[PDB]
A paper describes a structure:
To explore the putative acquisition of glycosylation at N245 and N354 in more recent variants, we determined the asymmetric cryo-EM reconstructions of the BA.2.86 and JN. S-trimer at pH 7.4, to mimic the physiological conditions at atomic resolution. In contrast to S-trimers from most variants ranging from WT, D614G through Alpha, Delta, Omicron to XBB and XBB.1.5, which sample the RBD-up conformation more frequently (>50%), BA.2.86 and JN. S-trimers dominantly adopt a closed state with all three RBDs in the down configuration, similar to structural observations of VAS5, a highly attenuated SARS-CoV-2 vaccine candidate. Compared to other variants, there are two additional glycosylation related modifications at N245 and N354 in BA.2.86 sublineages, among which N245 glycan lies at outermost region of each NTD around the triangular vertices of the S-trimer. Notably, the N354 glycan resides in a cleft formed by the NTD and RBD from two neighboring subunits, and establishes hydrogen bonds with T167 of NTD and with E340 of RBD, respectively, acting like a ‘bolt’ to lock the S-trimer in an ‘RBD-down’ state. In line with this, the N354 glycosylation confers a more compact architecture in the region formed by the three NTDs and RBDs. When the closed S-trimers were superimposed with its counterparts from XBB.1.5, the NTD, RBD, and SD1 from BA.2.86 moved inward to the 3-fold axis with the shift distances of 6 Å, 3 Å, and 2 Å, respectively, forming a tight packing between NTD and RBD. In line with these structural observations, BA.2.86 was previously reported to have compromised infectivity and attenuated pathogenicity in animal models. Structural comparisons with BA.1 revealed reduced interactions between domains, including NTD-RBD, RBD-SD1/SD1-S2, and S2-S2 in BA.2.86, structurally explaining compromised stability.
The dense glycan shield consisting of 22–23 N-glycosylation sequons per protomer is an essential feature of SARS-CoV-2 S architecture. The glycans have been shown to play intrinsic and extrinsic roles in protein folding, modulating conformational activation and immune evasion. The transition to the ‘up’ state exposures of RBD for the binding to hACE2 is also a prerequisite for S-mediated viral fusion, directly correlating with infectivity. Here, we dissected the role of N354-linked glycosylation, acquired by BA.2.86 sub-lineages, as a RBD conformational control element in attenuating viral infectivity.
Author numbering:
A (entry chain A): 727 to 1064
B (entry chain B): 47 to 68, 80 to 138, 158 to 210, 212 to 246, 263 to 482, 484 to 677, 689 to 726
C (entry chain B): 968 to 1144
D (entry chain C): 534 to 581
E (entry chain C): 727 to 774
The structure:
């Protein structure tokens, strides 16, 4: 489930009129058309941060797994954080990060190597040339992993009690017995085939890692979100090389190639093109942000129900009689293991 | 109301020069002057304006006296002490009620402070004033508005400024205005209670984007920061051969319009000052370019079409016109980018007994396509006769432009020469006389590489330009690399520094301190730009060494990094939050604590069961 | 806003310009105000969709939290939901979720089952818990120890397959009478 | 005429609406009126 | 409960410039304004 999108903070002044005073004066004649755009994108960014907060920040106390790890037979090393890794992330959580490629990290401070780009500069340098920047998320993808680790260590050491109040420790065999009792099967079944069910759980966990290793793309939803964002940004940059029926598409060209009395006609055309192009980007970003907010509210509800307890609604927390759920952090989203 | 204005205002906490008296320096005048004085009764009468203050240019004079004012516009000669000795060509006399008001409560301690503001926008001399009975002793800061008195259109040139004195048997407060954006707080009764600048302090720039005099706790995005370039490099090609415009303006037989001679001007330096000396022009109508802005452009090729035509036909020649010449003789294309030149020549297309050398075409089977010659002598058909001869219904196509020294101007030989440019993306073979300055790399500079104007940072590259390659670009079609015309080397181009400034402030009712966040830019770059004073931000927030913090979201100036962990208060970005905390108070940035560090006591057989309970009532909106 | 016109007042440019020429400026004003009223309408549509999502959420929250008890965790407030009381607010609704939250807990002991005589005994509804010396059955969300009887537990097993099974004696109210 | 819908041409300021007395505190140099969204509000009577 | 809407694939080229070459040439000067529209409508159809 996608949880957030790329946070953009476009500037009308530089995007429409790159370092130009005459064009800025002409744009001032359109009223507060671009204060609206800046406000809308600021609201979108704040809403994405709130979406991440809703989805992951569900536990106040950050829990930790016990120093030893023997949960009655259930093998959780595949989703618990790995101390050896510097990033402290799960093995299944690394594949999601290695299978999604972000065009712009945002937290790069890339300025200083557009000169050092040597070859033809890329999308990011090209966007920076026309005032088109991307903000970084408030929550790093290193403490989102900490939120996920706390959530997963609270559901395997305390059951669902940590989702209501104080985290009450409960052995994992008895937690499984309770989850079984919650779907209409008596507890004795689990205690009579605990070894078999532990083997089944371990096999199921083991065969979900290869299913993401070898598949072309199962994260195609998150990659679709990222591609839509980068492609909207690209189709918004590419509108700055369009004449819009003007003499030339370069402000620094038509400014030095015409006197101010006549250059106003062409600058007006370029402004009325770039404003209508930046109002398409803002509108599609608002619509996509509403869609992403719906998906993130769905993800937050799914976390609060599937993860912090047992859900009696059929086909909500996976197919079958739901028992438990594990969250995993993915680029701009979350992954549930039902 | 919280109305926001952009006009000439005296900057807040600016420099005002305080004088004394006991000779009378002539202060410069520009963008207006703010004047203030604190006096007992009267020692200052009025002011003098104008340029060079002599009997060669007009000037102003606004001396007050006991009852009236004496405003005028004139060309006074001098006084060197009756304040003038000349009123020769002098009019625009004006008289009204006096500007000076003085009142005393039976005592001289009421040293009323008189404040004045003058400006000369589009003439229309504006004067503002306000007499505050203060306590002018120390020029207080208590806000004080200014009411206009008179607005009179002198419409002159003012650069210098002076003042008059009085007699007898600590004043002169002068400040200079600047174009600034102000946010003014209006009282219910219509006065102005408070005003805040919008280019002074980070808090001020925020208080004037939330158009409010109170900024609630949080982080607010105000503007962006750019590094204005230090130097301007213009790198034109390695050619010094002056163009043959001489031999296109020094010719003797500018052909007739039916055969428009077309020369080609390439591999040359085009200084159009030689275009401006061989011809006392009558029509310099340029369409694609401004004639003033012609020495700073580079053209791939230049065509000089020369032909002598009659007077009305000069007005005829233009993009998208009509007539016997614009249709059958010479048709300028609609999207023309160039200039037309027409000057009078009845000394070379004239003689006694007359001349009829020139020619033109009134008879063509169709219109002439743009830039097409049609030299041919075919008799125009009439009726249905294939006739080959002259006479009725059988007409020769081209008739004469017989030129003689005596017709009206509407019928005289103007030697029309039109210049056609190709201002597109291609190697430039013709450029203006602009000199080729040196090259500086690793520094924000305005570049004019072979007519490609822009801004950015340049450096060495390892590109593999093919020998024919000249420009560079990227996947979104923005010019990336330019081959140096005089070094044949490859230089990449960077944005200036473009980013975004966000101001992190607590509530204004708590503190006036702020933190500044420059988005996604290394803080060494913003530090060197600040020390070079080349940053667009004119609000310079302090940098004490403990207020710099390279965040993954940019760098933070004005907040110190504490290594503790607290709940997030003001979200900055990338796991860093700022808050107003005691030391005795300052703004600190920290890494957000996700919650209490808790460890569960999971075991094989240990269980925690609640022996009690609580009932909590939460709220959801 | 002039939108690049002579003036921003229609009653001004109409009284200052003749109809043949004022059309150029009025067209500019129209194409500016129409594009300004199509931004307002579009953003109002987006905000209305968002408000509809929030109001559908509020209606579902009312129908579940108010008109019944919701077994969904963290939907009707934090904790085990008990009730919810609605309150009307300007352009919205306010919920007062009454929830049951546990309190002071103690480490006791637990075993998956109790093996009395060759047979594993499991709790009908609750946890086998131990003060430390005397095994007790109790609920899950509240401590209420009870004597382990044949009514509290159901019996099925062989006392060789349950891992962690503890040895204790269950009671029957039948042998005595 | 006040308290009646009338077309006004106050000193070249054309418009339509209803006029009446005010208790505004126009400074002597003040001539026009407006509000927070820049719409002409009150016009000082040129002959009263 | 509605489940889907009508799937449309409006084409800018014919909608804006019916079988016209000059009009298409002028429309090419507006950049990728209509590739965006086609992509949005295709996304809507796939989403339905
Ligand atoms: C839990 O599951 C782990 C799977 O990651 C097991 O780790 C394995 O370790 C062996 C080497 O001993 C590797 O060859 C194998 O690829 C895997 O990484 C781990 O042993 C297992 N532990 C228990 C108690 O079941
Ligand atoms: C706006 O102007 C009003 C008219 O003068 C002021 O009301 C007056 O207030 C004084 C006391 O200051 C009274 O004595 C007088 O009768 C009248 O009510 C009003 O205060 C003023 N508002 C301001 C200055 O904010
Ligand atoms: C247009 O007229 C120009 C000036 O007479 C010609 O330029 C010169 O022509 C002479 C020959 O008359 C050359 O010797 C000289 O090098 C220079 O080119 C130009 O040729 C002429 N063009 C046409 C198309 O007639
Ligand atoms: C469960 O928790 C209750 C409050 O959360 C306890 O009630 C308290 O009783 C004391 C008096 O003993 C009061 O002073 C206090 O205000 C509160 O009402 C209750 O005793 C407690 N029960 C157990 C068994 O711990
Ligand atoms: C086990 O649970 C018993 C509750 O029945 C507690 O035993 C009590 O002990 C007293 C005497 O000390 C008896 O009089 C009483 O009837 C009861 O049996 C006992 O405290 C508890 N064990 C622990 C370690 O808490
Ligand atoms: C619970 O009680 C059983 C009998 O009441 C024990 O079975 C015994 O097991 C021992 C070996 O451990 C045998 O030697 C003996 O004959 C009898 O079968 C059982 O072990 C005991 N379990 C625990 C955990 O105490
Ligand atoms: C005003 O001038 C003084 C004297 O040079 C200087 O110290 C002060 O900094 C100036 N004011 C400002 C705001 O720079
Ligand atoms: C002051 O100036 C006015 C200007 O007309 C003049 O009439 C008057 O005589 C002058 N002197 C005094 C004392 O008013
Ligand atoms: C006024 O200006 C004219 C301009 O030609 C000049 O001839 C004349 O001498 C001037 N009058 C003076 C200086 O009194
Ligand atoms: C005004 O005077 C200044 C200073 O001599 C000069 O540079 C400027 O060109 C003048 N302008 C006009 C319009 O006279
Ligand atoms: C033509 O050339 C001669 C060369 O001596 C020069 O004197 C004359 O001024 C030139 N005239 C024009 C119109 O170029
Ligand atoms: C530029 O011209 C100078 C002078 O002839 C020459 O020394 C230099 O090599 C030239 N450089 C290039 C790149 O043409
Ligand atoms: C940005 O970070 C630091 C601080 O300036 C320095 O290493 C250099 O300027 C940049 N480094 C990289 C890797 O971009
Ligand atoms: C305290 O902060 C400094 C930097 O300000 C950091 O180097 C150090 O590791 C911190 N100490 C602790 C215990 O966090
Ligand atoms: C739980 O049991 C396993 C295997 O019997 C053992 O390795 C582990 O140390 C035990 N842990 C506790 C807390 O009793
Ligand atoms: C249970 O005992 C462990 C061992 O010290 C302790 O850490 C934990 O807090 C205890 N839990 C309780 C008393 O609820
Ligand atoms: C308008 O003019 C008349 C005629 O002189 C005069 O009686 C009246 O007082 C004037 N009113 C104003 C407001 O000037």
């Amino acid at each position: 489930l996608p949880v957030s999108m790329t946070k953009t903070s476009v500037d009308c002044t530089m995007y429409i009129c790159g370092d130009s005073t005459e064009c800025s004066n002409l744009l001032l004649q359109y009223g507060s058309f671009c204060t609206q755009l800046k406000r809308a994108l600021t609201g979108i960014a704040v809403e994405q941060d709130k979406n991440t907060q809703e989805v992951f920040a569900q536990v106040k106390q950050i829990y930790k797994t016990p120093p030893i790890k023997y949960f009655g037979g259930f093998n959780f090393s595949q989703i618990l954080p790995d101390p050896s890794k510097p990033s402290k992330r799960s093995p299944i959580e690394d594949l999601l990060f290695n299978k999604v490629t972000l065009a712009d990290a945002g937290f790069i401070k890339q300025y200083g190597d557009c000169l050092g780009d040597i070859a033809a500069r890329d999308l990011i340098c090209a966007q920076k040339f026309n005032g088109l920047t991307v903000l970084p998320p408030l929550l790093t993808d290193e403490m989102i992993a900490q939120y996920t680790s706390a959530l997963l260590a609270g559901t395997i050491t305390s059951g669902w009690t940590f989702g209501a109040g104080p985290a009450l420790q409960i052995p994992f065999p008895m937690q499984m017995a309770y989850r079984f009792n919650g779907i209409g099967v008596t507890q004795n079944v689990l205690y009579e085939n605990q070894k078999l069910i532990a083997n089944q759980f371990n096999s199921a966990i083991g065969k979900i890692q290869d299913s993401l290793f070898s598949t072309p793309s199962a994260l195609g939803k998150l990659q679709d979100v990222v591609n839509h964002n980068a492609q909207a940004l690209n189709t918004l940059v590419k509108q700055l090389s369009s004449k819009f029926g003007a003499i030339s598409s370069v402000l620094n060209d038509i400014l030095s190639r015409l006197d101010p009395p006549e250059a106003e006609v062409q600058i007006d055309r370029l402004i009325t093109g770039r404003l209508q192009s930046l109002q398409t980007y803002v509108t599609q970003q608002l619509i996509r942000a509403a869609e992403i907010r719906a998906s993130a509210n769905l993800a937050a509800t799914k976390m609060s129900e599937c993860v912090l307890g047992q859900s009696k609604r059929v086909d909500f927390c996976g197919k079958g009689y739901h028992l438990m759920s594990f969250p995993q952090s993915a680029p701009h989203g979350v992954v549930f293991l039902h | 109301v919280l109305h926001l204005t952009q006009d000439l205002f005296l900057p807040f906490f600016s420099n005002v020069t305080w004088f004394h008296a006991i000779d009378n320096p002539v202060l410069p005048f520009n963008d207006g002057v703010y004047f203030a004085s604190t006096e007992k009764s009267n020692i200052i009468r009025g002011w003098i304006f104008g340029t060079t203050l002599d009997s060669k240019t007009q000037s102003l004079l606004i001396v007050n006296n006991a009852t009236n004012v004496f405003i005028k516009v004139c060309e006074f000669q001098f006084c060197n002490d009756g304040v003038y000795s000349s009123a020769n060509n002098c009019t625009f006399e004006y008289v009204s009620q006096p500007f000076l008001m003085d009142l005393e409560g039976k005592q001289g301690n009421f040293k009323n402070l008189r404040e004045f503001v003058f400006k000369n926008i589009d003439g229309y001399f504006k004067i503002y004033s306000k007499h505050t009975p203060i306590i002018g002793r120390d020029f207080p800061q208590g806000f004080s508005a200014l009411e206009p008195l008179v607005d009179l259109p002198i419409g002159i040139n003012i650069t210098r400024f002076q003042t008059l004195l009085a007699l007898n048997r600590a004043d002169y407060y002068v400040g200079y205005l600047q174009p600034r954006t102000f946010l003014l707080k209006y009282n219910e009764n219509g006065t102005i209670t408070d005003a805040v600048d919008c280019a002074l302090d980070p808090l001020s720039e925020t208080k004037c984007t939330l158009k409010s005099f109170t900024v609630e706790k949080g982080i607010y995005q105000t503007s962006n920061f750019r590094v204005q370039p230090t130097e301007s490099i213009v790198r034109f090609p390695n050619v010094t051969n002056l163009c043959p415009f001489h031999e296109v303006f020094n010719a003797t037989r500018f052909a007739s319009v039916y055969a428009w001679n077309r020369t080609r001007i390439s591999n040359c330096v085009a200084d159009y000052s030689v275009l401006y000396n061989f011809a006392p022009f009558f029509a310099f109508k340029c369409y694609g370019v401004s004639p003033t802005k012609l020495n700073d452009l580079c053209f791939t090729n230049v065509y000089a079409d020369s032909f002598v035509i009659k007077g009305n036909e000069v007005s005829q020649i233009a993009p998208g016109q009509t007539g016997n010449i614009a249709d059958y003789n010479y048709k300028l294309p609609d999207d023309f980018t160039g200039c037309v030149i027409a000057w009078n020549s009845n000394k070379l297309d004239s003689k006694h007994s007359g001349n009829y050398d020139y020619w033109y075409r009134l008879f063509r089977k169709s219109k002439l396509k743009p830039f097409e010659r049609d030299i041919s002598t075919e008799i125009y058909q009439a009726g249905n006769k294939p006739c080959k001869g002259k006479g009725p219904n059988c007409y020769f196509p081209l008739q004469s432009y017989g030129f003689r020294p005596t017709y009206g101007v509407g019928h005289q030989p103007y030697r029309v020469v039109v210049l056609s440019f190709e201002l597109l993306h291609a190697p430039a073979t013709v450029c203006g006389p602009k000199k080729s300055t040196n090259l500086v790399k690793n520094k924000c500079v305005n570049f004019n590489f072979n007519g490609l104007t822009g801004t950015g940072v340049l450096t060495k590259s390892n590109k593999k330009f093919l020998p024919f390659q000249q420009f560079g670009r990227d996947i979104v079609d923005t010019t990336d690399a330019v081959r140096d015309p005089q070094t044949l080397e490859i230089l990449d181009i960077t944005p200036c520094s473009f980013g975004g400034v966000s101001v992190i402030t607590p509530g204004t009712n708590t503190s006036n301190q702020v933190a500044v966040l420059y988005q996604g830019v290394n803080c060494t770059e913003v530090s060197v730009a600040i020390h070079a004073d080349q940053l667009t931000p004119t609000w310079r927030v302090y940098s004490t060494g403990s207020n710099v913090f390279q965040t993954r979201a940019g760098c933070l100036i004005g907040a110190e990094y504490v290594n503790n962990s607290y709940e997030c208060d003001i979200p900055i970005g990338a796991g860093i939050c700022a808050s107003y905390q005691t030391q005795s108070q300052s703004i600190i940035a920290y890494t957000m604590s996700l919650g209490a560090e808790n460890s569960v006591a999971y075991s094989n057989n240990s269980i925690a069961i609640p022996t009690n309970f609580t009932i909590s009532v939460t709220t959801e909106i | 806003s002039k939108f690049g016109a002579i003036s921003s007042v229609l009653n001004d440019i109409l009284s200052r310009l003749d109809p043949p020429e004022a059309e150029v400026q009025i067209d500019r004003l129209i194409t500016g105000r129409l594009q300004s009223l199509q931004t307002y309408v579009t953003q109002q549509l987006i905000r209305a969709a968002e408000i509809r999502a929030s109001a559908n959420l509020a209606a579902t929250k009312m129908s579940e939290c108010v008109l019944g008890q919701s077994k969904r965790v963290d939907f009707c407030g934090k904790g085990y939901h008990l009730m919810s009381f609605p309150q009307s607010a300007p352009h919205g609704v306010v919920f007062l979720h009454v929830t049951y939250v546990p309190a002071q807990e103690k480490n006791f002991t637990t075993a998956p089952a109790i093996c009395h005589d060759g047979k594993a005994h499991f709790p009908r509804e609750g946890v086998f818990v131990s003060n430390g010396t005397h095994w007790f059955v109790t609920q899950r969300n509240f401590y209420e120890p009870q004597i382990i009887t044949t009514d509290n537990t159901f019996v099925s097993g062989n006392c060789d397959v349950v891992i962690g099974i503890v040895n204790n004696t269950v009671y029957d109210p039948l042998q005595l009478e």
